[PDB]
Enzyme design. Structure first.
Site, PDB file in Angstrom:
ATOM      1  N   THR A 143      19.480  47.320  18.044  1.00  0.00           N
ATOM      2  CA  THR A 143      18.845  48.013  16.692  1.00  0.00           C
ATOM      3  C   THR A 143      19.826  48.147  15.304  1.00  0.00           C
ATOM      4  O   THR A 143      21.096  47.906  15.716  1.00  0.00           O
ATOM      5  CB  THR A 143      18.634  49.436  17.147  1.00  0.00           C
ATOM      6  N   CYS A 144      19.652  48.137  14.276  1.00  0.00           N
ATOM      7  CA  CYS A 144      20.401  48.270  12.959  1.00  0.00           C
ATOM      8  C   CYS A 144      21.341  49.625  13.141  1.00  0.00           C
ATOM      9  O   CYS A 144      21.814  49.731  11.915  1.00  0.00           O
ATOM     10  CB  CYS A 144      19.508  48.170  11.929  1.00  0.00           C
ATOM     11  N   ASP A 145      21.130  50.294  14.066  1.00  0.00           N
ATOM     12  CA  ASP A 145      21.984  51.622  13.896  1.00  0.00           C
ATOM     13  C   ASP A 145      23.325  51.545  14.549  1.00  0.00           C
ATOM     14  O   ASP A 145      23.447  50.624  15.733  1.00  0.00           O
ATOM     15  CB  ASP A 145      21.471  52.422  15.086  1.00  0.00           C
TER      16      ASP A 145
END
Ligand SMILES: Cc1ncc(COP(=O)(O)O)c(/C=N/CCCCCN)c1O
Ligand SMILES: Cc1ncc(COP(=O)(O)O)c(/C=N/CCCCCN)c1O
Lengths: 364, 370
Positions: free
Chosen positions: B318-320
């Site tokens: 994820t881009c988190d």
């Protein structure tokens, strides 16, 4: 406070659908888009599906003239199933398997992100299909340095991969507009450097998401928030096209959560209420988003007692509010969460096999 | 999930690679032999305690059937769990329902299947059972943070159950997950002893059951007490109870955790600030959600295990920026597609996975059921 009319809606909705619920107000999705559109004129707004990839949000936004920001194949499939024209989309995940690239291209999305040379090399196979945004950072996880950004743009020349421009994201719920200003200034200097270095000039600046919404504390109105951002953008050559990828700002305020009390006990001086929604469901953002939501009850009368709001799971970590003053509530009484639209249901689990809050679309 | 009814060490490396060949990545390889071995180890460590496998940590139909064939019973917390055991032919007399706070529907769904043991720890909950007084028998859950009444409050619940004609089956507690100190069980057992006696002296019906909950520890990165030594002072404490008393336990993690091995692959990579970052196709919104909800730390390795070892970062898909599974782990250089292997990946892992970004969940591959 909730208005008598807001109370009626919440209560009607529970009769018909049960509990827990997420009430999605399509009028607020519209209200938020238009406000941001007004606040940041001449910026193309690509809704980030990530915080809330609901098909009704997508339809509501598409009808408003919004564009779209995709991170995965799932998200591509979603927009496609709602007949969103692919020319209105960008794909922003900086790290992709060959299949992720293929899935998005097959649909018709041809804008992609790189922040490293390993990923740039993935595009040699596809150089006739794509144009790339280079994501800078200047938090540790994505974005290359200004200096590395040049290396990448250069290599992309040698390899014949088209670079569409630059992007960045300064972080979700950014309450200080100056961060964007600083980032825009940097991206301008990089764009300058690209030109008198002999390389194809960059057409686009994608300034990301992060526009903030009200939780328990109030944030700056959007017009006032974006004022210094607009002033910063005005220094870019007006041949540079500007995008944004708002997520939270559009979706967050449009969802109200509704949970009901399953049961209750006195524990060490406090009343514990055990709700049918919590940290493994709609309040997952307390864990993943370090979030804090305004919470309320329909019941307002009598003394406020030190209380705990717990989630449905047997887990100790499943506590929504550790210490909250509330009226005495009965089993079945409602607990309302505001600004529950972003990184809430999206990050829900199936722990204990508790059912997820059902999302109800209103003013569709 | 899917089953193989058919077909680190030399052998483990081989099965891993061929599964990745066949199913893709990320995967969770479930070994039903280890499900059996852990069940049997715990069973031997606690003579004459009926083990009710807690579905919560790994509510997997293969685990349920494997355990049913071993002679296990089941610990249920929800209608979804009820539905799972019912669909796998688990008889309802092998189950207890141990969620202390229940909607009326949660009682009726369990009762419709035929599960008639429930838990209460307060009088508001007790009162929900008035409609079912002919059908149920209750465990009173004591604490010694979120659930369980005090020893004094339990006596109130037990006296009031009498006045209202509700049967009390016994007492229960849960000392906490991954307990490394067996004396917590011991102390809890001693107190329950006392409460059970006080009930008799007040001339209430004698309690028939003691349920010692779960919390039995497993090896992650730090060695825990072997289960035999761990359970020894527990057996001592239990031997002081009337031989009339049936003892139950609710093991979850101890049975499922060592039975699962996670497999992720490197999607991409960059050198960032003096470290090689590898972005994997599984992370904290997937199989490593335990890093977040279970305060976890799993042994990790690579099939590569080879030359120069470089300070690296293992990030999820994820881009988190929260989605990082390990920082400054010294790994050899990996190519995209290379495998990162997690051990003791069975409990509170896939069960707490999300659909964030619509990234696909690891596929669970069940090995060695029969
Ligand atoms: C490339 C990119 N574009 C847009 C977004 C949406 O940002 P928001 O407007 O929702 O703050 C994001 C979201 N980023 C991180 C959100 C983390 C949620 C809190 N755990 C993003 O990574
Ligand atoms: C009533 C009850 N019985 C048994 C269990 C299983 O405990 P474990 O043996 O898995 O430690 C549990 C599990 N509790 C899970 C809390 C810790 C998981 C990580 N947050 C339970 O609530």
């Amino acid at each position: 406070v909730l208005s008598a009319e807001e109370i009626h809606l919440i209560e009607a909705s529970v009769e018909q659908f049960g509990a827990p619920l997420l009430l999605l107000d399509c009028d607020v999705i519209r209200q938020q888009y238009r406000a941001l559109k007004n606040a940041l004129p001449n910026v193309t707004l690509h809704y980030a599906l990530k915080p809330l990839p609901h098909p009704v949000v997508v339809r509501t936004l598409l009808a408003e003239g919004a564009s779209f920001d995709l991170a995965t194949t799932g998200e591509v499939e979603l927009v496609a199933s709602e007949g969103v024209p692919a020319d209105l989309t960008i794909h922003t995940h900086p790290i992709k398997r060959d299949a992720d690239i293929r899935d998005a291209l097959a649909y018709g999305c041809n804008v992609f992100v790189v922040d490293n040379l390993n990923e740039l090399e993935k595009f040699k196979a596809y150089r006739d299909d794509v144009e790339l945004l280079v994501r800078l950072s200047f938090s540790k996880k994505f974005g290359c340095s200004p200096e590395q950004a040049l290396v990448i743009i250069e290599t992309a020349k040698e390899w014949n991969i088209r670079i569409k421009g630059l992007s960045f994201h300064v972080g979700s719920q950014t309450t200080n507009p100056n961060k964007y200003v600083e980032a825009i200034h940097t991206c301008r200097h990089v764009m300058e450097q690209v030109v008198e270095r002999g390389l194809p000039a960059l057409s686009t600046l994608d300034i990301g998401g992060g526009f903030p919404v009200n939780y328990t504390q109030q944030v700056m109105p959007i017009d006032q928030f974006c004022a210094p951002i607009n002033e910063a953008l005005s220094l870019l050559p007006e041949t540079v096209h500007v995008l944004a990828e708002p997520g939270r700002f559009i979706c967050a305020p449009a969802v109200t959560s509704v949970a009901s009390v399953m049961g209750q006990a006195e524990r060490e001086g406090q009343i514990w209420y055990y709700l049918d929604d919590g940290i493994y469901g709609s309040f997952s953002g307390l864990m993943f988003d370090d979030a804090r939501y305004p919470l309320t009850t329909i019941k307002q009368g009598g003394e406020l007692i030190p209380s705990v709001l717990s989630g449905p799971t047997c887990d100790s970590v499943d506590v929504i509010a550790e210490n909250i003053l509330l009226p005495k509530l009965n089993n079945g009484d409602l607990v309302i969460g505001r600004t529950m639209g972003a990184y809430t249901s999206a990050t829900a689990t199936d722990f204990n096999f508790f059912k997820r809050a059902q999302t109800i679309a209103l003013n569709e």
